[PDB]
Amino acid sequence: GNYNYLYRLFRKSNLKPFERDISTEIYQAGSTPCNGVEGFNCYFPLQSYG
Amino acid sequence: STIEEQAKTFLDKFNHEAEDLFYQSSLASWNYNTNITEENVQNMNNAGDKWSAFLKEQSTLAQMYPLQEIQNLTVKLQLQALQQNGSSVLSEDKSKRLNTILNTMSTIYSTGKVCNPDNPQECLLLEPGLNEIMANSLDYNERLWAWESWRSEVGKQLRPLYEEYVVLKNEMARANHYEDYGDYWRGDYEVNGVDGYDYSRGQLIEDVEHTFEEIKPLYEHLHAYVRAKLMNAYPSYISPIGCLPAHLLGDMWGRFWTNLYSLTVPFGQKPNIDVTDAMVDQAWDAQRIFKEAEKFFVSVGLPNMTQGFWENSMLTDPGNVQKAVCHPTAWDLGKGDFRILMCTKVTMDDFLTAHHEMGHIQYDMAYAAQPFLLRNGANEGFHEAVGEIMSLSAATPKHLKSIGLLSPDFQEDNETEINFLLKQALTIVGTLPFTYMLEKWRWMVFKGEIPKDQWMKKWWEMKREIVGVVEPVPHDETYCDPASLFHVSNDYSFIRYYTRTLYQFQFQEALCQAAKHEGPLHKCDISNSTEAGQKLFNMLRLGKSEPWTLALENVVGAKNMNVRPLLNYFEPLFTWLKDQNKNSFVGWSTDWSPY
Numbered sequence: 001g002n003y004n005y006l007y008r009l010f011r012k013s014n015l016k017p018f019e020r021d022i023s024t025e026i027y028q029a030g031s032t033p034c035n036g037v038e039g040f041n042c043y044f045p046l047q048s049y050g
Numbered sequence: 051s052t053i054e055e056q057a058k059t060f061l062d063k064f065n066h067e068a069e070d071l072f073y074q075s076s077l078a079s080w081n082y083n084t085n086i087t088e089e090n091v092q093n094m095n096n097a098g099d100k101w102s103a104f105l106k107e108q109s110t111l112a113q114m115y116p117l118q119e120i121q122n123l124t125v126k127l128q129l130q131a132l133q134q135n136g137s138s139v140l141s142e143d144k145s146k147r148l149n150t151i152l153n154t155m156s157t158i159y160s161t162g163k164v165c166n167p168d169n170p171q172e173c174l175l176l177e178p179g180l181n182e183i184m185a186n187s188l189d190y191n192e193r194l195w196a197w198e199s200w201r202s203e204v205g206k207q208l209r210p211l212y213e214e215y216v217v218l219k220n221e222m223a224r225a226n227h228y229e230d231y232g233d234y235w236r237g238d239y240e241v242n243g244v245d246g247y248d249y250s251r252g253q254l255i256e257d258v259e260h261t262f263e264e265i266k267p268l269y270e271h272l273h274a275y276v277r278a279k280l281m282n283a284y285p286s287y288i289s290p291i292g293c294l295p296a297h298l299l300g301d302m303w304g305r306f307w308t309n310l311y312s313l314t315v316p317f318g319q320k321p322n323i324d325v326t327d328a329m330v331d332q333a334w335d336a337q338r339i340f341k342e343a344e345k346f347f348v349s350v351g352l353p354n355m356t357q358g359f360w361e362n363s364m365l366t367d368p369g370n371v372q373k374a375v376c377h378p379t380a381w382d383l384g385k386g387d388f389r390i391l392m393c394t395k396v397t398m399d400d401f402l403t404a405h406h407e408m409g410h411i412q413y414d415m416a417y418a419a420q421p422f423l424l425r426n427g428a429n430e431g432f433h434e435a436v437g438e439i440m441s442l443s444a445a446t447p448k449h450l451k452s453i454g455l456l457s458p459d460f461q462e463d464n465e466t467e468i469n470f471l472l473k474q475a476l477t478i479v480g481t482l483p484f485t486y487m488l489e490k491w492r493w494m495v496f497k498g499e500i501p502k503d504q505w506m507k508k509w510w511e512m513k514r515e516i517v518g519v520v521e522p523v524p525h526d527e528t529y530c531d532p533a534s535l536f537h538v539s540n541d542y543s544f545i546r547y548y549t550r551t552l553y554q555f556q557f558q559e560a561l562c563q564a565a566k567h568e569g570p571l572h573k574c575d576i577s578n579s580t581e582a583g584q585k586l587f588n589m590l591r592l593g594k595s596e597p598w599t600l601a602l603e604n605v606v607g608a609k610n611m612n613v614r615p616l617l618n619y620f621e622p623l624f625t626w627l628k629d630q631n632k633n634s635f636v637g638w639s640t641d642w643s644p645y
Contacts, residue, residue: 001070009066010059029056040114041056043063050070050385 005049057115057125064108064132065422069384071101072422076383083391084364086373109133123243124595128423131594139225140218148218151211152541158207159539164199180302185309190287193297194522200302205529208539212530213502219541220496232493235543239429241597247609249599255493258545261552261613262486268620269483271627272475273518274636279314290635292642293520303535304519307480311473317465323447325455329396332454336365336394339401342453343408346444350576351583352412359388359411367393378403380410380437384425388415402441409440417593428598431549436590438550439557443576445470452577467572471623478551479620485548487516491532492544506531514640522644552611559615560606561586571619 010027028034030041038044078094112132120126137145162176174180183196223231236251273294280288280298287295300309348354368374376393383389390407394400413436417425427433443449447466450456491512494500500508506525509532514520525531537544562574564582576582589605603609617624 001074009062027059029051029059031051043059047063047066050073 001050003048003050006046007049008045009047010043011045053115053119054122054125057120057129058122060112060115061125061128061132061421061423064112068101068104068108069422071097071104073383073385073387075101076381076387080381080383080389080391083375083377083379086375106138109135109138124424126243127594128421131423135226137222140222144218144221148215148222151215151218155208155211155215155539159536163203164196166199184297184302185300190284190298194295197297197302198523201525201531201534202529204534205525205531208533209528209530212533216495220498223496229497230493231496233497235545239598241599244597244600247597247599249597257611258486258489258548261611262483264613264617265479265482268475268479268617268624268627269518270636271624271631272479273638274631274634275627276310276314277518277638278631278634283313287644289642289644291639292644293514293518293638293640295644296519296521299519303484304517305481305484305535307476311476314472314476315469316472317469320465320469323456323466323470325398325450326396328455328457329398334396336396339394339396339404340365340408343401343405346405346449346453346577347408347412347440349578351580351587353415355411356386356388358386359390362387363389364391365394367395378407380407380414382411382414382425384422386418402445405444406437406441409437410434413437413590416587416590417595419591420593420595424594426594428592428594428596428601429549430543430546431553432598434546435550435554435557439554439561442554442558443561443574446573446575448573448575449577468623468626471572471620471626475620475623482548482551483517485544487512488532488535488538489545489548490516492538503527511640514638518638520643524645549611552613552616555615555619556606556608556612559618570622572622 012027015021024045026034026036026038027043027045028041029043032039032041034042075094075097078090078097082090082094109132112129113135115129115133117126117129117133120129137148140148160176162174162179164172164174164179166172180196180200184193187193219231223229223234226234228234228237233251236254239249239254240251241247241249277288277290277294280294281290287298296304300307344355364374367376374393378390378392381389381391388411390404390411392400392404392407394404410433413427413433414425427436447456447460451458451460491500491509494508495505506527506529510521510525533539535544536542558574559571561576561582562571564585565574565576565579566581567574585605589601592601592604599609
């Protein structure tokens with residue numbers, strides 16, 4: 001299985017046409033603040049493919 | 051902000067993180083089943099443990115999300131399927147005790163022993179032993195002896211443990227806000243949220259009883275016919291008023307009566323529909339069988355196969371060069387890798403089994419464009435019925451004649467049709483009353499309607515009232531009789547087969563009516579059609595995304611479980627049974643005993 005590829009799965013906003021960003025901020029859906037790790041409403045933006 | 055977006059995000063993350071683990075577990079299981087070594091089974095066990103730990107962690111994380119404020123039906127169903135507590139409701143000590151009980155029961159049921167006296171050992175296994183002993187015998191004493199010995203050897207070691215087993219099961223059921231374990235099993239068919247197509251938990255029992263009330267005449271006629279045949283064969287071991295013996299059913303448990311067709315065949319002097327000679331004369335192999343199956347499925351309307359199905363499946367038994375279990379299973383890795391594991395040879399039974407496996411693969415590929423929590427059948431009976439209806443439809447002689455197996459010059463007499471109907475009834479209708487009795491007994495023993503000291507007392511009387519089988523020797527309470535089967539001794543559902551049987555006839559009737567065909571149903575063809583295939587594909591792609599009550603009407607039309615298709619199918623056999631049993635007595639009495 002190949003796992004060298006990653007992709008963005010969740011973010012607060014979408015992407016504009018011809019836009020490229022390498023920001024890897026954690027997504028926060030709920031009102032609970034995220035300190036830098038995952039949890040209830042904190043998730044990691046990058047996900048390894050297969 | 052809202053909870054629905056958080057739930058959808060968590061579900062998508064769970065699917066994306068669990069698909070890879072499921073694929074790895076499937077690959078490990080495939081490597082184990084195709085190569086019996088130590089590293090393969092070690093990797094399989096490691097993958098299974100990692101998958102179980104990940105599933106438990108995800109369930110504990112999802113239990114924090116409520117289930118009332120969920121407005122989406124699919125999200126609610128996925129949350130209900132993910133937040134399943136399982137055995138976590140009990141303490142650690144109780145959990146490990148239940149696991150040890152399950153393991154020791156599995157080992158006891160798998161080892162097997164006979165150990166006949168007067169001989170040095172005479173201790174054989176289960177399948178190469180009691181199965182062939184009670185399946186290929188023509189004597190009355192040896193079958194009774196083997197049945198009694200096996201039942202006693204099972205009871206004397208499973209009686210003190212079955213009480214603790216059912217107590218732990220009732221405790222685990224009540225710890226999850228369920229009234230009993232039978233209710234926990236019936237909750238799989240329960241659907242909520244959608245109005246107009248709901249289905250209560252108690253309605254299933256009423257529907258099963260209503261179907262059994264109409265199945266009763268056919269079962270009584272079949273029992274009368276079997277009793278007449280036994281009286282014509284054995285004039286001193288069966289009475290026209292009593293029930294049938296227990297050890298003369300051709301099976302250890304009396305579930306399948308396939309071995310009874312060879313002794314109760316009406317037209318044994320006439321040839322059968324076996325096309326083995328035509329296959330071995332035209333130089334057939336395992337590849338051409340799957341080729342013809344793919345041609346049939348693509349003529350019905352099913353799409354083609356993937357490029358990995360024909361390069362990864364083991365269509366040839368390697369033999370003694372390497373160990374490989376020859377057991378037909380439709381493996382679904384979840385990431386487009388579909389392959390069949392079966393040592394298919396030149397045999398009509400192997401042909402039907404390959405058709406069944408290909409139907410299962412097609413059913414799995416139908417809802418392939420769905421999340422991981424939705425790539426599964428609606429209930430525990432549709433997934434097998436969809437595969438069995440293709441085999442039941444392909445069993446027609448006209449299909450084999452059109453393919454090239456059966457020669458064009460072939461008679462269409464009614465004797466072969468009656469023989470085929472009787473052979474199908476001995477393996478389909480014969481197991482329905484036993485299944486119903488076992489399911490009712492398990493429900494009443496898990497709910498509390500049966501006293502603890504009256505388990506066997508209720509079992510041996512339900513075996514005579516509901517089923518037309520009487521034991522040749524009374525058994526005390528120390529013999530754990532009802533737990534002699536494989537599903538009850540390993541915690542597996544048994545009503546799934548009954549639901550599959552009641553649904554396969556409906557599916558066959560729907561596919562025959564949608565193909566613009568008229569006449570008898572036993573010879574109705576499904577291939578070379580464009581409406582039936584589309585109607586089937588429109589329903590197989592639903593999966594868990596829609597309730598089964600709403601999905602049933604999209605392929606048939608009815609909104610409930612009906613049995614009329616079974617009556618319409620067995621009418622040519624029901625009339626023949628009425629004509630043959632007109633001079634003989636119909637029914638059985640619970641007063642007579644072969645003691």
